[PDB]
Design an enzyme around this catalytic site. Structure first.
Site, mmCIF file in Angstrom:
data_model
loop_
_atom_site.group_PDB
_atom_site.id
_atom_site.type_symbol
_atom_site.label_atom_id
_atom_site.label_comp_id
_atom_site.label_asym_id
_atom_site.label_seq_id
_atom_site.Cartn_x
_atom_site.Cartn_y
_atom_site.Cartn_z
ATOM 1 N N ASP A 116 -2.905 -9.908 2.619
ATOM 2 C CA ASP A 116 -2.613 -9.080 1.422
ATOM 3 C C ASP A 116 -3.327 -9.700 0.223
ATOM 4 O O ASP A 116 -3.714 -10.857 0.271
ATOM 5 C CB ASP A 116 -1.135 -8.974 1.115
ATOM 6 C CG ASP A 116 -0.808 -7.699 0.341
ATOM 7 O OD1 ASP A 116 0.367 -7.553 -0.004
ATOM 8 O OD2 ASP A 116 -1.673 -6.770 0.094
ATOM 9 N N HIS B 112 -7.293 -10.638 -5.588
ATOM 10 C CA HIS B 112 -6.650 -11.511 -6.624
ATOM 11 C C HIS B 112 -6.945 -12.981 -6.381
ATOM 12 O O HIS B 112 -6.471 -13.816 -7.119
ATOM 13 C CB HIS B 112 -5.154 -11.233 -6.669
ATOM 14 C CG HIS B 112 -4.868 -9.866 -7.167
ATOM 15 N ND1 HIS B 112 -5.064 -9.529 -8.511
ATOM 16 C CD2 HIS B 112 -4.522 -8.728 -6.512
ATOM 17 C CE1 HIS B 112 -4.777 -8.255 -8.662
ATOM 18 N NE2 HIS B 112 -4.374 -7.746 -7.461
ATOM 19 N N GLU C 1 -6.560 -6.662 2.461
ATOM 20 C CA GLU C 1 -6.179 -5.642 1.456
ATOM 21 C C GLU C 1 -6.973 -5.847 0.167
ATOM 22 O O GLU C 1 -6.635 -6.731 -0.613
ATOM 23 C CB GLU C 1 -4.692 -5.697 1.132
ATOM 24 C CG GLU C 1 -4.247 -4.532 0.283
ATOM 25 C CD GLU C 1 -3.425 -4.879 -0.962
ATOM 26 O OE1 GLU C 1 -3.695 -5.930 -1.601
ATOM 27 O OE2 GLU C 1 -2.581 -4.040 -1.365
ATOM 28 N N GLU D 104 -8.091 -12.576 -10.929
ATOM 29 C CA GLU D 104 -7.907 -13.705 -10.009
ATOM 30 C C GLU D 104 -6.987 -14.783 -10.579
ATOM 31 O O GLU D 104 -6.266 -15.435 -9.812
ATOM 32 C CB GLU D 104 -9.270 -14.309 -9.643
ATOM 33 C CG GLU D 104 -10.177 -13.303 -8.927
ATOM 34 C CD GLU D 104 -11.639 -13.687 -8.752
ATOM 35 O OE1 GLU D 104 -12.072 -14.735 -9.320
ATOM 36 O OE2 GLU D 104 -12.356 -12.921 -8.019
ATOM 37 N N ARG E 242 9.877 3.187 2.244
ATOM 38 C CA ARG E 242 10.316 2.091 3.137
ATOM 39 C C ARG E 242 11.495 2.567 3.979
ATOM 40 O O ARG E 242 12.360 1.764 4.332
ATOM 41 C CB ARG E 242 10.598 0.806 2.358
ATOM 42 C CG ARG E 242 9.339 0.173 1.780
ATOM 43 C CD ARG E 242 9.177 0.392 0.294
ATOM 44 N NE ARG E 242 7.857 -0.103 -0.149
ATOM 45 C CZ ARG E 242 7.586 -1.346 -0.524
ATOM 46 N NH1 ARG E 242 8.537 -2.284 -0.558
ATOM 47 N NH2 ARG E 242 6.364 -1.661 -0.918
ATOM 48 N N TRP F 134 7.535 -12.051 -1.194
ATOM 49 C CA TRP F 134 8.083 -12.943 -2.253
ATOM 50 C C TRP F 134 8.388 -14.329 -1.662
ATOM 51 O O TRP F 134 9.563 -14.803 -1.686
ATOM 52 C CB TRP F 134 9.332 -12.271 -2.888
ATOM 53 C CG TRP F 134 9.100 -10.960 -3.575
ATOM 54 C CD1 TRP F 134 7.919 -10.434 -4.023
ATOM 55 C CD2 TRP F 134 10.143 -10.084 -4.046
ATOM 56 N NE1 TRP F 134 8.169 -9.276 -4.708
ATOM 57 C CE2 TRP F 134 9.504 -9.028 -4.743
ATOM 58 C CE3 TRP F 134 11.535 -10.066 -3.906
ATOM 59 C CZ2 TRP F 134 10.253 -7.971 -5.284
ATOM 60 C CZ3 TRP F 134 12.270 -9.033 -4.443
ATOM 61 C CH2 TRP F 134 11.617 -7.974 -5.097
ATOM 62 N N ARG G 196 -3.410 -9.492 8.779
ATOM 63 C CA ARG G 196 -3.628 -8.609 7.624
ATOM 64 C C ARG G 196 -3.389 -9.490 6.422
ATOM 65 O O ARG G 196 -2.267 -10.069 6.307
ATOM 66 C CB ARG G 196 -2.749 -7.354 7.652
ATOM 67 C CG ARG G 196 -2.969 -6.467 6.439
ATOM 68 C CD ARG G 196 -1.981 -6.884 5.311
ATOM 69 N NE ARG G 196 -2.024 -5.838 4.358
ATOM 70 C CZ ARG G 196 -1.206 -5.605 3.361
ATOM 71 N NH1 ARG G 196 -0.197 -6.404 3.094
ATOM 72 N NH2 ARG G 196 -1.459 -4.565 2.588
ATOM 73 N N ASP H 266 2.866 1.270 0.102
ATOM 74 C CA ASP H 266 2.404 1.077 -1.297
ATOM 75 C C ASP H 266 1.917 2.384 -1.924
ATOM 76 O O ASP H 266 1.428 2.323 -3.067
ATOM 77 C CB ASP H 266 1.317 -0.010 -1.350
ATOM 78 C CG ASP H 266 1.765 -1.398 -0.973
ATOM 79 O OD1 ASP H 266 2.985 -1.716 -1.194
ATOM 80 O OD2 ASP H 266 0.876 -2.162 -0.437
ATOM 81 N N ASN I 284 -2.150 -15.461 -2.159
ATOM 82 C CA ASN I 284 -2.316 -15.398 -3.634
ATOM 83 C C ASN I 284 -1.115 -15.986 -4.381
ATOM 84 O O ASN I 284 -1.286 -16.582 -5.500
ATOM 85 C CB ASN I 284 -2.580 -13.951 -4.051
ATOM 86 C CG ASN I 284 -2.777 -13.822 -5.542
ATOM 87 O OD1 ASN I 284 -3.830 -14.265 -6.044
ATOM 88 N ND2 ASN I 284 -1.775 -13.184 -6.181
ATOM 89 N N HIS I 285 0.084 -15.717 -3.906
ATOM 90 C CA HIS I 285 1.303 -15.923 -4.735
ATOM 91 C C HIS I 285 2.538 -16.292 -3.923
ATOM 92 O O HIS I 285 2.664 -15.943 -2.723
ATOM 93 C CB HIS I 285 1.604 -14.704 -5.606
ATOM 94 C CG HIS I 285 1.814 -13.458 -4.825
ATOM 95 N ND1 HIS I 285 0.773 -12.528 -4.602
ATOM 96 C CD2 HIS I 285 2.925 -12.934 -4.282
ATOM 97 C CE1 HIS I 285 1.254 -11.525 -3.914
ATOM 98 N NE2 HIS I 285 2.574 -11.732 -3.691
HETATM 99 C C1 LIG Z 1 0.756 -6.546 -0.985
HETATM 100 C C2 LIG Z 1 1.801 -5.700 -0.255
HETATM 101 O O1 LIG Z 1 1.116 -4.742 0.610
HETATM 102 C C3 LIG Z 1 2.740 -4.992 -1.306
HETATM 103 O O2 LIG Z 1 3.731 -4.203 -0.664
HETATM 104 C C4 LIG Z 1 3.368 -6.060 -2.202
HETATM 105 O O3 LIG Z 1 4.403 -5.464 -3.035
HETATM 106 C C5 LIG Z 1 5.631 -6.216 -2.968
HETATM 107 O O4 LIG Z 1 5.886 -6.841 -4.235
HETATM 108 C C6 LIG Z 1 6.011 -5.906 -5.319
HETATM 109 C C7 LIG Z 1 6.019 -6.718 -6.623
HETATM 110 O O5 LIG Z 1 7.096 -7.574 -6.652
HETATM 111 C C8 LIG Z 1 7.205 -4.969 -5.084
HETATM 112 O O6 LIG Z 1 7.380 -4.031 -6.163
HETATM 113 C C9 LIG Z 1 7.035 -4.322 -3.695
HETATM 114 O O7 LIG Z 1 8.161 -3.545 -3.361
HETATM 115 C C10 LIG Z 1 6.734 -5.285 -2.570
HETATM 116 O O8 LIG Z 1 6.326 -4.594 -1.370
HETATM 117 C C11 LIG Z 1 2.281 -6.699 -3.006
HETATM 118 C C12 LIG Z 1 2.785 -7.626 -4.109
HETATM 119 O O9 LIG Z 1 3.639 -8.648 -3.607
HETATM 120 C C13 LIG Z 1 1.210 -7.353 -2.148
HETATM 121 O O10 LIG Z 1 0.076 -7.669 -2.985
HETATM 122 S S1 LIG Z 1 -0.715 -6.595 -3.905
HETATM 123 O O11 LIG Z 1 -0.095 -6.600 -5.246
HETATM 124 O O12 LIG Z 1 -0.781 -5.249 -3.247
HETATM 125 O O13 LIG Z 1 -2.058 -7.172 -3.940
HETATM 126 CA CA LIG Z 2 -4.754 -15.249 -7.926
#
Ligand SMILES: *[C@H]1[C@H](O)[C@@H](O)[C@H](O[C@H]2O[C@H](CO)[C@@H](O)[C@H](O)[C@H]2O)[C@@H](CO)[C@@H]1OS(=O)(=O)O
Ligand SMILES: [Ca+2]
Ligand SMILES: *[C@@H]1O[C@H](CO)[C@@H](O)[C@H](O)[C@H]1NC(C)=O
EC number: 3.2.1.1
Length: 476
Positions: free
Chosen positions: A206, A210, A230, A162, A344, A83, A204, A297, A121-122
């Protein structure tokens, strides 16, 4: 370090917040349901490098390092690193720029690599898309750098995948307009300068699916190191083409059938056997993919089954498959958490025992891989060959003729019966002595060239020529 340099590596993936505190506590509370910073740091990682290197890992992957949104959101803190708001500051929760440089240097003194997780991406923001104050994002301090606010709803519309935003109305993930030259140029300058400031060996990346494909060649080139993406899709026809724009991707195609094959005594060896051969043929280079069964994840492997034999077999596969093994901190202590946030868990609450069943298994498997690579420069580019399957068994061969590792894996589980499997196609010569390097027994290849493999306890079997083990510390 280059893609060719990375082929021989074995990665321990950890959450900086969850692996090790500066104070070294093994009792400090970390309730995963609170979704708050638990206090893991870069200094804490340095202090526990003997624990990681004792399992025979050569590298670590740590979660993102950039400064994050400050709030405790309705979904908790930015403890995970995904974030970001200010890409030119570090997340002070983990320590200082000198601490991140001290971690890189500590790994280098041990002949190990540092891989850092990055997002292009974000950004992140506490609140709905319409409430975003774009001025908090550094350097992207304007709505002009972002795609218009919308959510991804049609995952079959690659344009929507995307151009629309991840996240939701509670925590928004403002989507950078990566088609803009100004956004490409800032990201490319940033990643090159991140890598050179912290002496990072690989990345890596992520969230790769997207961001439109034409972003990625320039990003991988600016990074100047091996990048593994990823690409969250089990279909090799979707995922493997990303290796035309990036050095490697995480092996999500193998993930699903690998999990299915070992999570149950009824799992499909056919689906795994078939996917290895699909990836080998149809992916640009299977030897630059990352093999895993557990991450932050998805539910942990032990959330599906607590059978320790099944856990040993899936860990052996991860280490002995084509490409770069990736084990997620806690897997080696048989952690059983489910979906986020339950996966986690803090590694320190285990007490970091070096005598647990899966620490010993992973050490044994990394030991033979590291030794075989040290003696066989063709090991990493010999494409893994599945030579046998039945309802409860897969066997595979990898390495140069005369030095090949032959692995026999089972989903019979801990109550599996005792029998002899007569294995053909291993490629060893009649009378050859082999060491089973997990349990340190010996088998002899028969006059017909078949290997009589003793099977028991659902245990994985990893064979290597006894004559080739001269001077190794393996099975002393
Ligand atoms: C990739 C990363 O591996 C993944 O953990 C990210 O999730 C993170 O953000 C989400 C959404 O806010 C939370 O719910 C989560 O706990 C937190 O780890 C993820 C999104 O930011 C990253 O991108 S992707 O969506 O896997 O492409
Ligand atoms: Ca995008
Ligand atoms: C790396 O340090 C240089 C020189 O001080 C600076 O220009 C740059 O912004 C830094 N990059 C990162 C990603 O911190």
């Amino acid at each position: 370090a280059t893609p060719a340099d990375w082929r021989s590596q074995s990665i321990y993936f950890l959450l900086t917040d969850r692996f090790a505190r500066t104070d070294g506590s093994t009792t400090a509370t970390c309730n995963t349901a609170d979704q708050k910073y638990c206090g893991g740091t870069w200094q804490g990682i340095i202090d526990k490098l003997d624990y990681i290197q004792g399992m025979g890992f050569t590298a670590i992957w740590i979660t993102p390092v950039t400064a994050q949104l400050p709030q405790t959101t309705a979904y908790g803190d930015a403890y995970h690193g995904y974030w970001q708001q200010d890409i030119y500051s570090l997340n002070e929760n983990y320590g200082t720029a000198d601490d991140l440089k001290a971690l890189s240097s500590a790994l280098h003194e041990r002949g190990m690599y540092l891989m850092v997780d990055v997002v292009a991406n974000h950004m992140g923001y506490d609140g709905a898309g319409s409430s975003v104050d774009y001025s908090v994002f550094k350097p992207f301090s304007s709505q002009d750098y972002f795609h218009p606010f919308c959510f991804i709803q049609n995952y079959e519309d690659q344009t929507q995948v995307e151009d629309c935003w991840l996240g939701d109305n509670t925590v928004s993930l403002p989507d950078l307009d990566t088609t803009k030259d100004v956004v490409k140029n800032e990201w490319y300058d940033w990643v090159g300068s991140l890598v050179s400031n912290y002496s990072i060996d690989g990345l890596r990346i992520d969230t790769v699916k997207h961001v439109q494909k034409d972003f990625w060649p320039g990003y991988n080139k600016a990074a100047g190191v091996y990048c593994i993406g990823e690409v969250l899709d089990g279909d090799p026809a979707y995922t493997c083409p990303y290796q035309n724009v990036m050095d490697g991707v995480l092996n999500y195609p193998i993930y699903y059938p690998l999990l299915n094959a070992f999570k149950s005594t009824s799992g499909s060896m056919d689906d795994l056997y078939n996917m290895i051969n699909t990836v080998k043929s149809d992916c640009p280079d299977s030897t630059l993919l990352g093999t895993f069964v557990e991450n932050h994840d998805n539910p942990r492997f032990a959330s599906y089954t607590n059978d320790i034999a099944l856990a040993k077999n899936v860990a052996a596969f991860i280490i002995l498959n084509d490409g770069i093994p990736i084990i997620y901190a806690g897997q080696e202590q048989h952690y059983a958490g489910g979906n986020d946030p339950a996966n986690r868990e803090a590694t320190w609450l285990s007490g970091y025992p070096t005598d647990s069943e899966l620490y010993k298994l992973i050490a044994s498997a990394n030991a033979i891989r590291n030794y075989a690579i040290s003696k066989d420069t063709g090991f990493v580019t010999y494409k893994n060959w599945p030579i046998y399957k039945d309802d409860t068994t897969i066997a595979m061969r990898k390495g140069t003729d005369g030095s090949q590792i032959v692995t026999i894996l089972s989903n019979k589980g801990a109550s599996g019966d005792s029998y002899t499997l007569s294995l053909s196609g291993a490629g060893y010569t009649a009378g050859q002595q082999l060491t089973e390097v997990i349990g340190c027994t010996t088998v002899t290849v028969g006059s017909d060239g078949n290997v009589p493999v003793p099977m028991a306890g659902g245990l994985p079997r990893v064979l290597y020529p006894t004559e080739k083990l001269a001077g190794s510390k393996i099975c002393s």
